[PDB]
Symmetry: C3
Subunit: 628 residues, 3 copies
Amino acid sequence: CLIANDGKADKIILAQDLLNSRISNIKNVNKSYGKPDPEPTLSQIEETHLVHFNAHFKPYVPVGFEYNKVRPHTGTPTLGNKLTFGIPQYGDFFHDMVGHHILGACHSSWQDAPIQGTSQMGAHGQLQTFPRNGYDWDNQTPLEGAVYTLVDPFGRPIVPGTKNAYRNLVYYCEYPGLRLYENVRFEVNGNSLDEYSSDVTTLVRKFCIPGDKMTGYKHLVGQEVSVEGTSGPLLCNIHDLHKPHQSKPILTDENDTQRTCSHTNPKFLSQHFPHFPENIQTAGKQDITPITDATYLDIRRNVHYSCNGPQTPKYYQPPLALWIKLRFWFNDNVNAIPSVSIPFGERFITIKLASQKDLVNEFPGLFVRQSTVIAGRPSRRNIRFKPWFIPGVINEISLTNNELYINNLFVTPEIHNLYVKRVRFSLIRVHKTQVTHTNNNHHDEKLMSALKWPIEYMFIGLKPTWNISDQNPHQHRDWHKFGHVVNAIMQPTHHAEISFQDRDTALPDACSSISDISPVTYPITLPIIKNISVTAHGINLIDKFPSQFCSSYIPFHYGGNAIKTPDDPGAMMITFALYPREEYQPSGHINVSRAREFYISWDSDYVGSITTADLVVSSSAINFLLLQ
Amino acid sequence: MASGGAFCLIANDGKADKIILAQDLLNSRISNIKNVNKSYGKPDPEPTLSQIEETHLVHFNAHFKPYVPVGFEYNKVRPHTGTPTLGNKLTFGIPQYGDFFHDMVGHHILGACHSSWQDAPIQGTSQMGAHGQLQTFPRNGYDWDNQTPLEGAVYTLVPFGRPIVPGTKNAYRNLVYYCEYPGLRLYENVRFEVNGNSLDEYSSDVTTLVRKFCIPGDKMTGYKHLVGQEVSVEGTSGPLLCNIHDLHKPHQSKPILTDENDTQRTCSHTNPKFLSQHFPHPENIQTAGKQDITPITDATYLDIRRNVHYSCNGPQTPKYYQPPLALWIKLRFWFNDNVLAIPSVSIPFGERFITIKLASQKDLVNEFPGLFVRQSTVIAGRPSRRNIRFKPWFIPGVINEISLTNNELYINNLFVTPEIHNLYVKRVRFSLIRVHKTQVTHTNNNHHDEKLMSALKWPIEYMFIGLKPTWNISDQNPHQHRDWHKFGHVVNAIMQPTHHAEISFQDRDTALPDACSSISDISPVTYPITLPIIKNISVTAHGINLIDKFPSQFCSSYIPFHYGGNAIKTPDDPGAMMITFALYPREEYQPSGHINVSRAREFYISWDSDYVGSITTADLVVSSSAINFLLLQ
Amino acid sequence: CLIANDGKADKIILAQDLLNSRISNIKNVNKSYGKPDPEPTLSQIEETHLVHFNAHFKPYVPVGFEYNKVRPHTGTPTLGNKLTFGIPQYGDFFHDMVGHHILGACHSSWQDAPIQGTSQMGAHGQLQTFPRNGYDWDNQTPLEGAVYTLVDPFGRPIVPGTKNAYRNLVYYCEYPGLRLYENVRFEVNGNSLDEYSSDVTTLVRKFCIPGDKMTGYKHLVGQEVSVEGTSGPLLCNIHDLHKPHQSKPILTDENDTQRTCSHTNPKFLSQHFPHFPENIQTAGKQDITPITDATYLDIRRNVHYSCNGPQTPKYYQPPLALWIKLRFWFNDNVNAIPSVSIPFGERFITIKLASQKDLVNEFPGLFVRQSTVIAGRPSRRNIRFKPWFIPGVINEISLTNNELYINNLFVTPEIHNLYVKRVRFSLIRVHKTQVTHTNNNHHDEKLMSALKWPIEYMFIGLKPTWNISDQNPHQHRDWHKFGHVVNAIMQPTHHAEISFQDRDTALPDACSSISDISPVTYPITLPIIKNISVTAHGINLIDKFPSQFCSSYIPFHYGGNAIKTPDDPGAMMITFALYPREEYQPSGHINVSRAREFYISWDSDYVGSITTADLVVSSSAINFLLLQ
């Protein structure tokens, strides 16, 4: 084949001359001096080259393992720190450790009804009321004419007038997995080593986990999943564009399916199967170039995505299985924690869980009626619902099962004596965090501390405290976001304009009808920070860059594949290295022990006094320790 | 003019940077090397990057390697004139054209399908029978289901639009559609063998339990188009206006609601931000060449939105005719892997065969409802006047058994120069390869049962579990050729997006119009839901419990997540499982741990459940990945 | 654990005997040498093994950097080549370089109204007007009866009859990021080195970037992102299939919600929570052992996707930020472009920006009302809209601000002095390209030129010039496609079927209503080429293969995990190296300088003289370059 194509161009890259010279010389040497067995193996010839159809052997070192199990340590449920696990020396080494919890089923206490035509308000910072049987708009402003008739949430179970019962739907919070573990701390002999919070694990969910292993993390921490959908076949006309003044006499309305000069219609003959939208008998072959006919009424199918899980409001939430993973330096690449130079005892884990108040919301189950106003003859019907969410009390369900599977690594009894008496160092990566508060809506500043080890990574964000304020209706739905989230409700209306009058062919201002079901929300997130600057002792280490440079490009290019991009453009990222966790060998670091001073400045358009903002910052401080 | 520049953060070290930098060692070495190469008469007193790379890893310097010349050319091997679709329709030979082998691809063309002309149910009462169940539209408006006193209804039969049919006197055709993912269903058995020595072999279960655990989240559409599966295209919508609704603060503004007018005076959220980022100036009135700063508390007013609609097309939609598909198939071996494989320098002429046992027709193609038995157009008095509810009505019977047309076996090679082709023609060498195992088994004992594993003799370093209920494979089920590759009890969740047309021509009596209404429908809509079956896994060998009992979601979603090495996706359907006795699960070529089943001839798999029984059993499939090597000659 | 299961088959792969022999020999050596460490360390054992619970170190050389900034070179606005940047001598090396451009907001030219039911035609390749106030269909045919009014797109703000004003919506082009830079060029001291065009940037977006960073790319190059949506809860009637005739209810309208067969109820009643579809009391347990039925009214929540961004049609587009990356051999893996031995200055870029007439379209701003006919009582009303407009969006928005963020690589002044007097060659990659025109609808061929350097890469795509044709109404929205696209319109109507007659229970042919809002499109692509053939001087390199081979298998299997697959089946790809741009080492190449002749043939079904086609070809050549 084309393998004899070389010369002055690819000579240096190929080295065919030196290769053949080496082969001939080694063949002569082996035939004359050595054993009478020419044509050596792929070891001597592969000394000044690189062959492809070959491999490199390496006697594998022995190792085994078995997934262990550890129970809690007599921990009260969710109220306090519901766990303090141990490290029982079952195996020999340590590795990843996963938590396990089963949240109890939640219910809803029986609620009352709006006894009279006007009941007192109060369920949030605001509330609603349905006044005087539709005669008024909202407690005043007498409208033209309207009426009220109470409905119920899950469909149309019409509730009797102002005296009945109605429960309240209960739904969990989005991403409830990494909300329970509000704080973690792993200490040996009392010396705390690493830790994080509910913010660091939120600043890693967007970055570390690649898009390949997505459904795993989406089903492991009790997050709702988007199940596929389908439908039946629905006919749709197909319309192409040919040319101007070529086949455009006029657009057809009810007849004359002709006057269409094609665009090489054999191209649209075997691709869309245009001869089979009709019930009449069709041959088992093609139908070529009919009179002004290229493609007619292809078959199209629609898709209706849906979901089902904890985020769907139901009268009874079944007990989910919210797995939680511990991300440390031991729960990383095994290329860790020998667990043999540590004596028996003084090895604990502290997990300060959260409360039940910020995990179980409610949903309105009343749906105060809509003012079916008849504005004279035109616009006869009209329905616009408004929730009537007088509160309930949820329940006191708590977790019952708690486990921590801690796999180990076994070692043969021969290797088990050389590393137990000696001491060995190793470079590990840990977490640091120092969150603060901010103000000064103008071009403010701040300062960073609690960072003393050499740093080769970073993270910046800006979480408004308004998102964590318990009085917000979307506190337990959009808390992990990183921006001022606004809702844009819509209305998938169902227009029905029918006129029974056989005469009066003018506009139908006599008989019309509108309707609706429920509002539809969309989480719209916006960025907050507009500029970023990192200075240290006068010299500006990183010039003023916009948001979309530290939020989109730096995560895009750096890290290769092991770093995705945040779906929200608010999360920042700063890197002082070339291999941000994609590799193990260090790729530089801006030291902090020698540079005490440090700064982070930024402009804003949302900080101030009414809507404050508490930024968060993490890091991966390279630091090496000694075992014994 | 040889001073320092901006003096960036590079002269910053200390107590924790010495070990990582070793600037003292670097300076000592570079100075000694400079003195050495200047003491021996060199015109370049500075050493290149060769002398400093002894114990340092520099980034701005590559490393060359003379690339040994190789090439390839996609050959083409027609079949062995085997039988059509019914029997094993292929046993491909091997031409000694090149010198090596690599990944191989199948190819197949499926003929066109049609429908057999039927007759309309001329009489208002017909005999049933098209599946395990059937129905009839009775008496043209007298009965609900073949007998019931019903007040009012009309049953006029009427697929692809509104094809109205004269009263019970016409014909019709049956819509035809293929099965989802036919590429993993056609090839039912593959067995590579030389000189009659069968080496590799698997079944139609490895082709399913690798599709979810080999391809990453990037080649999704690539595979979907390779195996001729339906694809999802994007769409747009007409520009429509949508309202906006922001929450400002508590008690900062107490405007409850106004029906028609007076929408203003609401607590603000630092307006300048919400104005610029939204540009609230949807209006026809004059819009100047700049942005307007908050006319009246205009934080967010009338944001613009556009919807998105998905759509589909291909072999997975019911049509009266199907163009010839092209179902490319791969051959998952150890040769269709990293480029070594199949030296083919000591293999004689011939004596290299493949075998591909195809499937039949009755397990791929089905029919589809075309009649759409008339809806119960009931008139329930004044309230809920109109009401529509369609229903299918089959009339099966068709063959159209067009089989696999021209089908090749595109296969590459690795040509070598005639010089190298003599140094490895006489030598013999081994290489650790991977060969798949499979031992299916039927099961019973609904309670916490167990089993015994067999058909496993090689040292094993990988594992698969699964549980596919036989109801999915039972051809008498009306949902077999749509959700057959699932690994859990599938259930359909029909719904109906009705039309609420509540018109009231009554000019007075503004109260509840309980006299006129309208309900409608179009067609059914399904939702395949997957629910796992296995609740625990406990693999044991020689009595000692090697792996304790673990929930399904630990062996389904987590164990491919923490492991895998960015090369193992996670299954959508949680029914699949996975166990690993190594550290590099197929991501690396070097083995990373394996337990031996040759010396330990005992092996057990125990699992509790609540779905097995007698009315619907379940057959579990188990794959593997052996680690065994071969020799040349 | 079970790790002592040795034998005779795993000898070659474990070498436990040789491991024990080596460790015993080194132990006896250490004991006879008189050392206080009788056990050997991890140093002498790794000669013929590979430990897994251990890592390797590498003393790293220090290196810093800082993202600099360069301004334009007083070039023209978007009309001409709006930039020719330079290089500042602030750093010591080169690396990835991102541009930055913003586009000022636009406006709309106020137009008049169609004063009468007949006016002048001509507003695009095709045009039309609203006819005869409803008497006719195109002012040339009697019709039953209708009436024509006007409406604005954003809703239905009924326009006064044939007397008002209106604007025209302004919407940007799809993927404006890879459309500005029509031609790039990099040259040092006049000598040109590499270049590309918009075709190469559109043939590298579908292949190079993995599927993970798609979210980042969509925000980088300014494309609307499909933000997730939610909806309200609604019940669905679940209905499973048990067995053939095991229990045979035919059908029922409203009753008989039982009597189906069993499917091991404890399993099918514990995963759907049958205790929360009803208002009646729900105990603190399940509802096990009910009358035989699989499930009872599961809860479902739909998901509505929604899009927003510069691609949506509005009246005023805020200033976007079209970030653009530059793909070279310098903006790639730095494991480049020293520019230390290069003199100061004398190195520029060139960016021939595109035009403004092909980046902004218009949208119809006055929809002619539909044929509101009255065809008797049944199917009386009917609405189907049609567009109507008048261009004039020639407004002069242009790119005001421009920068070029170039990072560097600072070196310690100790390494900076060893290679400042030396020259080094290194294998690099460029982007050759040669576009051409074609004809001969039948099984034609062509010739390839401007390719002489050794090639280890390829791309082929047949793009019909009907798309980029100026008069195409969909040109600046669907231009990045590689196939003849056809629009498949639909109509999600809303029906109304009411019988006003309280008696006469016959079919509701007394009142029937139709409606519509706006058409909906779904761009579908189709491949043109059916076979490929690459020959050179008689021999055949690649046999005739279907389009689905060089487009969906070769990129699939090759490239590893760094090459996505094209969603559009039009683009193809040929490889001549075993590693298609996955690694850095060369892995195959056919020199095309020794063999000057070259041919690329292909069948077709769309070429001709009505809609011609032009094939695009890129590559990645290899040719090392020297500094001094």
